[PDB]
Short mmCIF file of C-alpha atoms in Angstrom, two decimals:
data_model
loop_
_atom_site.label_atom_id
_atom_site.label_comp_id
_atom_site.label_asym_id
_atom_site.label_seq_id
_atom_site.Cartn_x
_atom_site.Cartn_y
_atom_site.Cartn_z
CA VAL A 3 115.24 72.68 125.12
CA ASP A 4 117.59 75.66 124.81
CA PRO A 5 118.26 75.39 121.05
CA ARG A 6 114.47 75.32 120.55
CA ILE A 7 113.84 78.72 122.12
CA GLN A 8 117.08 79.89 120.48
CA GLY A 9 115.95 79.14 116.93
CA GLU A 10 112.47 80.40 117.76
CA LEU A 11 113.67 83.79 119.03
CA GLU A 12 116.05 84.09 116.09
CA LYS A 13 113.15 83.56 113.69
CA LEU A 14 111.01 86.15 115.47
CA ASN A 15 114.01 88.49 115.34
CA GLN A 16 114.02 88.14 111.56
CA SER A 17 110.26 88.74 111.73
CA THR A 18 110.45 92.04 113.63
CA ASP A 19 113.27 93.16 111.33
CA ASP A 20 110.87 92.54 108.44
CA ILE A 21 108.28 94.57 110.35
CA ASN A 22 110.67 97.52 110.63
CA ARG A 23 111.42 97.32 106.91
CA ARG A 24 107.73 97.38 105.99
CA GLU A 25 107.15 100.29 108.38
CA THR A 26 109.83 102.45 106.77
CA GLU A 27 108.44 101.41 103.39
CA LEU A 28 104.94 102.55 104.37
CA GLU A 29 106.15 105.91 105.69
CA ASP A 30 108.07 106.50 102.46
CA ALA A 31 104.96 105.60 100.46
CA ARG A 32 102.67 108.05 102.25
CA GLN A 33 105.29 110.81 102.14
CA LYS A 34 105.44 110.23 98.38
CA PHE A 35 101.63 110.44 98.21
CA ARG A 36 101.53 113.85 99.91
CA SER A 37 103.80 115.70 97.47
CA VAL A 38 101.83 114.32 94.54
CA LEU A 39 98.49 115.41 95.98
CA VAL A 40 99.69 118.93 96.80
CA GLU A 41 101.16 119.14 93.29
CA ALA A 42 97.70 118.24 92.00
CA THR A 43 96.31 120.97 94.25
CA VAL A 44 98.55 123.78 93.00
CA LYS A 45 98.23 122.76 89.34
CA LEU A 46 94.45 122.57 89.62
CA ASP A 47 94.42 125.98 91.29
CA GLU A 48 96.64 127.60 88.65
CA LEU A 49 94.67 126.11 85.75
CA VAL A 50 91.43 127.33 87.31
CA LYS A 51 93.11 130.71 87.75
CA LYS A 52 93.82 130.66 84.02
CA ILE A 53 90.19 130.63 82.88
CA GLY A 54 87.49 130.06 85.50
CA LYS A 55 84.39 131.12 83.56
CA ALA A 56 85.04 128.51 80.87
CA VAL A 57 85.36 125.71 83.43
CA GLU A 58 82.36 126.73 85.55
CA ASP A 59 80.30 126.96 82.36
CA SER A 60 81.74 123.64 81.18
CA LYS A 61 80.65 121.67 84.25
CA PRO A 62 76.93 121.42 83.28
CA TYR A 63 77.94 119.80 79.98
CA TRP A 64 79.90 117.10 81.79
CA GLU A 65 76.93 116.65 84.13
CA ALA A 66 74.55 116.10 81.22
CA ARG A 67 77.11 113.73 79.69
CA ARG A 68 77.23 111.64 82.87
CA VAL A 69 73.43 111.53 83.08
CA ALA A 70 73.26 110.52 79.41
CA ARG A 71 75.79 107.75 80.05
CA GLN A 72 73.80 106.42 83.01
CA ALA A 73 70.66 106.43 80.88
CA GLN A 74 72.74 104.71 78.20
CA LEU A 75 73.75 101.80 80.41
CA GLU A 76 70.19 101.47 81.73
CA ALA A 77 68.64 101.51 78.25
CA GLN A 78 71.19 98.97 77.03
CA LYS A 79 70.37 96.64 79.92
CA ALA A 80 66.64 96.99 79.23
CA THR A 81 67.19 96.19 75.55
CA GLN A 82 69.27 93.08 76.29
CA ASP A 83 66.75 91.82 78.86
CA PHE A 84 63.98 92.33 76.31
CA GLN A 85 65.95 90.28 73.77
CA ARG A 86 66.36 87.44 76.27
CA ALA A 87 62.62 87.60 76.98
CA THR A 88 61.83 87.37 73.26
CA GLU A 89 64.07 84.30 72.94
CA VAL A 90 62.40 82.63 75.93
CA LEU A 91 58.95 83.22 74.43
CA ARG A 92 60.16 81.89 71.07
CA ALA A 93 61.31 78.59 72.57
CA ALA A 94 58.26 78.31 74.83
CA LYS A 95 55.97 78.65 71.80
CA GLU A 96 58.07 76.39 69.56
CA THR A 97 57.62 73.61 72.12
CA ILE A 98 53.83 73.85 71.99
CA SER A 99 54.00 74.07 68.20
CA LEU A 100 55.80 70.73 67.94
CA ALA A 101 53.56 69.21 70.62
CA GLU A 102 50.46 70.30 68.70
CA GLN A 103 51.94 68.88 65.50
CA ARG A 104 52.26 65.56 67.34
CA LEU A 105 48.51 65.54 68.03
CA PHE A 113 55.40 58.06 75.03
CA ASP A 114 52.44 60.44 74.76
CA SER A 115 52.45 61.02 78.53
CA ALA A 116 55.88 62.68 78.41
CA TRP A 117 54.68 64.91 75.58
CA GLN A 118 51.57 65.82 77.58
CA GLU A 119 53.62 66.73 80.66
CA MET A 120 56.08 68.72 78.56
CA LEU A 121 53.47 70.78 76.70
CA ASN A 122 51.56 71.25 79.95
CA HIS A 123 54.59 72.66 81.77
CA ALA A 124 55.35 74.83 78.75
CA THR A 125 51.78 76.15 78.49
CA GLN A 126 51.95 76.77 82.24
CA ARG A 127 55.10 78.85 81.77
CA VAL A 128 53.98 80.86 78.72
CA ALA A 129 51.78 83.10 80.89
CA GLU A 130 54.64 84.34 83.04
CA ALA A 131 56.60 84.47 79.80
CA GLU A 132 54.10 86.93 78.32
CA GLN A 133 54.05 88.98 81.53
CA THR A 134 57.85 89.26 81.50
CA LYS A 135 57.57 90.19 77.82
CA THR A 136 55.23 93.09 78.57
CA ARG A 137 57.34 94.30 81.49
CA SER A 138 60.52 94.08 79.42
CA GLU A 139 59.09 95.98 76.46
CA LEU A 140 57.49 98.77 78.49
CA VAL A 141 60.67 99.20 80.53
CA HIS A 142 62.58 99.19 77.23
CA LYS A 143 60.42 101.98 75.82
CA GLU A 144 60.71 104.09 78.97
CA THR A 145 64.48 103.67 79.20
CA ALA A 146 64.92 104.56 75.52
CA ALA A 147 62.74 107.64 76.01
CA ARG A 148 64.72 109.01 78.96
CA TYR A 149 67.83 108.04 77.05
CA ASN A 150 67.06 110.09 73.95
CA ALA A 151 65.73 112.96 76.04
CA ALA A 152 69.05 113.19 77.90
CA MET A 153 70.83 112.99 74.53
CA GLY A 154 68.72 115.91 73.30
CA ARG A 155 69.45 118.12 76.31
CA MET A 156 73.12 117.21 75.99
CA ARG A 157 72.97 118.21 72.32
CA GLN A 158 71.43 121.63 72.97
CA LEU A 159 74.02 122.03 75.73
CA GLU A 160 76.87 121.22 73.35
CA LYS A 161 75.43 123.84 71.00
CA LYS A 162 75.94 126.59 73.59
CA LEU A 163 79.22 125.41 75.14
CA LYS A 164 81.59 124.91 72.20
CA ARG A 165 83.96 127.59 73.49
CA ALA A 166 84.08 126.48 77.12
CA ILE A 167 84.40 122.69 77.10
CA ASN A 168 87.36 122.77 74.69
CA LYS A 169 89.20 125.01 77.13
CA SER A 170 88.26 122.87 80.12
CA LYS A 171 89.12 119.55 78.45
CA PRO A 172 92.86 119.54 79.29
CA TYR A 173 92.17 120.67 82.86
CA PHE A 174 89.78 117.77 83.40
CA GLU A 175 91.99 115.18 81.71
CA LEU A 176 94.92 116.29 83.88
CA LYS A 177 92.68 116.20 86.95
CA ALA A 178 91.64 112.69 85.91
CA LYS A 179 95.21 111.42 85.49
CA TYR A 180 96.30 112.82 88.84
CA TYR A 181 93.13 111.38 90.37
CA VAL A 182 93.73 107.80 89.23
CA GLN A 183 97.42 108.14 90.14
CA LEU A 184 96.73 109.27 93.72
CA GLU A 185 94.00 106.62 93.88
CA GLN A 186 96.42 103.81 93.08
CA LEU A 187 98.94 105.33 95.51
CA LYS A 188 96.41 105.33 98.35
CA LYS A 189 95.53 101.74 97.46
CA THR A 190 99.21 100.83 97.76
CA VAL A 191 99.48 102.55 101.15
CA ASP A 192 96.38 100.73 102.41
CA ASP A 193 97.21 97.16 101.40
CA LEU A 194 100.85 97.65 102.41
CA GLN A 195 99.79 98.79 105.88
CA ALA A 196 97.47 95.78 106.11
CA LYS A 197 100.30 93.38 105.26
CA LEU A 198 102.41 95.16 107.88
CA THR A 199 99.72 94.53 110.49
CA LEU A 200 99.68 90.86 109.48
CA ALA A 201 103.46 90.69 109.95
CA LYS A 202 102.99 92.17 113.42
CA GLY A 203 100.50 89.38 114.04
CA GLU A 204 103.10 86.79 113.05
CA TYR A 205 105.82 88.28 115.29
CA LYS A 206 103.34 88.38 118.15
CA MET A 207 102.50 84.73 117.51
CA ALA A 208 106.17 83.82 117.82
CA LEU A 209 106.18 85.68 121.15
CA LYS A 210 103.14 83.67 122.24
CA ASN A 211 105.11 80.54 121.38
CA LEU A 212 107.87 81.85 123.63
CA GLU A 213 105.35 82.21 126.47
CA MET A 214 104.06 78.70 125.77
CA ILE A 215 107.53 77.15 125.98
CA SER A 216 108.31 79.22 129.08
CA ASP A 217 105.18 77.64 130.55
CA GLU A 218 106.36 74.22 129.37
CA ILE A 219 109.85 74.17 130.89
CA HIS A 220 109.07 75.23 134.47
CA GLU A 221 106.46 72.46 134.52
CA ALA A 222 109.12 70.02 133.34
#
């Protein structure tokens, strides 16, 4: 049973070598992340040190823009849902129209009865959908108005702050992806450790096997 434990321990040796490789890889990754983030720090600081008033005055505009976008998505959803509701009502009424024109009669009766049982909830959903639609559109356009009057008084600031924020954005998504890489890589490393450990457990199992033999 010697070649068995031999091959086993060789395989786990390859495994722990792999572990070492992934460890060094991870360390290198994080060390790469750090320099990038501090670069982002100093560039952000220097660009703020360029013109601070423009940026600080620009922020409310971006705030209003975000709010307006949220209201946009909400209003869009409300509109779509209302459309679906309208379609549902259309079909539900078309059914009863045909059924009434007909006046296998039992099947027709059951069908029109189920339909005319569903049209009530249909109408309720219609009302809900349309009122929600109106509200959403209202808040929507209100936010658009405030954003407009904000854009009227911030033409000089936001243009200056635009490159700062786009740079900040690029560095943000970059460091984000980097951190992602670090995370999943470390996870895979842990899994590898699990594998190596499992090979060791096999070693213990065989060690238990032989002395019993």
